[PDB]
């Protein structure tokens, strides 16, 4: 079957529900992103080359890689589950536009507070700019549904979810943005999104 | 038609060369991102909302964002063209993958040197990640075609041909990874690269 290379917590867990979410059949491969070794204790760097989380594996044995694509991806196994406006459709764009959106300007954005080694002063700028993005979403949440795309649950929610989840972590403080809070509260409550966090030991 | 709200050598000169590549129909409105005004002194803020070129302004007038989904649009209307692999391929996902990966860990690396208020730590650490990365696309290269997909010459030639323009003008040296060197060279002669650059003043 599919093989997700993953690390407990990190971005690779917005895959890691969507193929429970979709109901797809995988193996989790654990990652330690300290020395790019497997759980099996194989070289990891043979998997993906770039060296990050997640990387997923199919049976052609063929690697693919980058969150928002990998979502996309499993999205397309099963357009019967709708995690995804149809092909053809211009509401598709709007969802790739939502998981571009996060991954440059939400997923990046946490760099300096994961690096061992930034300033202070870079990770005051992360914040700010964090926040200005926040500020976007929760205006967009302020106007939409319950999720990303409104009434239909996404992808892009998985994602979003998942990044936002750093924050009470890295002790963020996103009183400032209730709606996003929800949110937040509203994707943990999902019972696929509770099965993948069990099982990634974040519960 | 469509309008192109851009800043002279920004990321928005991606899809600025892709419509010259697809032979698009389209108009140029330039955005002041100091005052975030248009040209025609209108409130860019009104058109993107997240306050960043590229924006795409169809004639529902509509408005897309995020380049690499700009891209991704604008190679749709002429699938004829072949900017990119034809829907329900795999190789598509390969190409998505490419666009995925610049956006974010090339694109946004280039944070901090383009923030007046950032410390030298952070630009040092842009640099260095920035060069891991530098060493797979070299790779990459050096394993295939002369254009990122190899043969094809695709949307994510523009993207990252464009973001890379940046190092000479940084005073970055990319003396280290000649492939990439020629490869922007390569980028560069195409007609259509011209002809924006030469719109844009970049000549
Ligand atoms: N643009 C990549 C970024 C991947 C990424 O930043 N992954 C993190 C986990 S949240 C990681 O494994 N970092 C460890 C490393 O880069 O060595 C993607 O979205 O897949
Ligand atoms: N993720 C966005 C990033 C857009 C972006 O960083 N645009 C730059 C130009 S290279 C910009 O207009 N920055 C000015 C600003 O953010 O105020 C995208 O790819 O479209």
Redesign the interface.
């Known amino acids: 079957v599919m093989k997700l290379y993953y690390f407990p917590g990190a971005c690779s867990l917005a895959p890691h529900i969507v193929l429970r979410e979709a109901g797809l059949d995988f193996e989790l491969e654990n990652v330690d992103l300290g020395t790019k070794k497997t759980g099996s204790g194989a070289d990891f760097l043979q998997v993906n080359?770039?060296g990050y989380v997640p990387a997923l594996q199919l049976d052609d044995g063929?690697v693919?890689?980058?969150?928002?694509?990998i979502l996309?991806?499993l999205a397309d196994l099963k357009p019967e589950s709708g995690l995804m406006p149809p092909?053809g459709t211009?509401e598709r764009?709007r969802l790739?536009?939502w998981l571009?959106?996060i991954?440059?300007?939400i997923?990046?954005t946490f760099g300096?507070f994961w690096?061992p080694?930034?300033?202070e002063?870079?990770k005051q700028?992360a914040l700010g700019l964090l926040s200005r993005?926040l500020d976007?979403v929760e205006?967009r949440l302020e106007a939409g549904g319950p999720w990303l795309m409104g009434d239909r649950y996404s992808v892009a929610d998985a994602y979003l979810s998942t990044v936002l989840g750093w924050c009470e972590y890295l002790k963020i403080d996103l009183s400032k943005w209730p709606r996003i809070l929800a949110y937040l509260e509203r994707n943990q409550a999902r019972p696929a999104v509770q099965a993948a966090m069990k099982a990634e030991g974040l519960i």
Chains 1, 2 share one sequence.
């Open positions: 080359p770039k063929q693919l890689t980058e969150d928002q694509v996309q991806y092909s211009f764009y790739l536009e571009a959106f991954s440059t300007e997923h990046k300096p690096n080694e930034s300033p002063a870079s700028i993005r976007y205006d």
